[PDB]
């Protein structure tokens, strides 16, 4: 899953441009907008009605940074990655009850948002360079599901 710096650094470089925050609350709101059955386990969360509701929800915005801090914690530990999301995995299974497929579905929101922020700076060679890493996070939070 690792890479020649050629693309493995583009990420480390490209994430440097972007706020690791306005992206999270951006990708999570979207997760809830495009897949609206996702608002289950969000009932301690309040008004999610309209995409404008969801977008302007300071819980979603609040949870944005957390999900990102973790995402960062991967970003540093790109090899470790299964034994570091160890704690959230049992938590995303045996107490939030998430279905393992939505990690990939969030990931995709992170990528769609990452080139929403970056337009052209972002390209297939760099786009997919992140994918490997998103798709590696989904497979790291879903190991304890069994």
């Amino acid at each position: 899953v690792h890479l020649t710096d050629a693309e493995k650094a583009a990420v480390s470089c490209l994430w440097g441009k972007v706020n690791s925050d306005e992206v999270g609350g951006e990708a999570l709101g979207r997760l809830l907008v495009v897949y609206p059955w996702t608002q289950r386990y969000f009932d301690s969360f309040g008004d999610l009605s309209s995409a404008s509701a969801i977008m302007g929800n300071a819980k979603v915005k609040a949870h944005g940074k957390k999900v990102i801090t973790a995402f960062n914690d991967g970003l540093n530990h790109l090899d470790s990655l299964k034994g570091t999301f160890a704690s959230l995995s049992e938590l995303h299974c045996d107490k939030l009850h998430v279905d393992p497929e939505n990690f990939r579905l969030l990931g995709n929101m992170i990528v769609i948002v990452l080139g929403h922020h970056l337009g052209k700076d972002f390209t297939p060679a760099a786009q997919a360079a992140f994918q490997k890493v998103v798709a590696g996070v989904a497979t790291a939070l879903a190991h304890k599901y069994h």
């Binding site: 907008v33 977008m55 929403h116 337009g119």
Partner: protein, 141 residues
């Protein structure tokens, strides 16, 4: 199952695109082939290099096809009917790949419409493809 104010946004958002339409698909495809390599093997004959008359060649007709869809949402099966079995028994394309493309087409559209890529719009587009990709794959099973 779409609508009713969904068609408005589809069209609305598909409105910005215009003449830029053809070019998008083309790069999305590149994204795919970068993001999901095995997708490439549906195009053994294409040259897949960053710039291609060959991918710009098929892409435009990708982009057309949807552009056609955006104008006939009351029945898209009926329109996409040509491409319908073409992908099913002639081409034998794996369903998992259509969602693969949508994702890449969406990563394309948001590089290019930063101020028009909004959650209502973004959703109305995920839908758009969903139905299309669904309508498309209706001739497998």
């Amino acid at each position: 199952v779409l609508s009713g104010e969904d068609k408005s946004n589809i069209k609305a958002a598909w409105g910005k695109i215009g003449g830029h339409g053809a070019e998008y698909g083309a790069e999305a495809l590149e994204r795919m082939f970068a993001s999901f390599p095995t997708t490439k093997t549906y195009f053994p004959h294409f040259d897949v290099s960053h710039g291609s008359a060959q991918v710009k060649g098929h892409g435009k007709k990708v982009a057309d096809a949807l552009a056609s869809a955006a104008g006939h949402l009351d029945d898209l099966p009926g329109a996409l009917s040509a491409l319908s079995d073409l992908h099913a028994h002639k081409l034998r394309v794996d369903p998992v790949n259509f969602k693969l493309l949508s994702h890449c087409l969406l990563v394309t559209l948001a590089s290019h419409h930063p101020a028009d890529f909004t959650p209502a719009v973004h959703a109305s587009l995920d839908k758009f493809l969903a139905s299309v990709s669904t309508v498309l794959t209706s001739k497998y099973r």
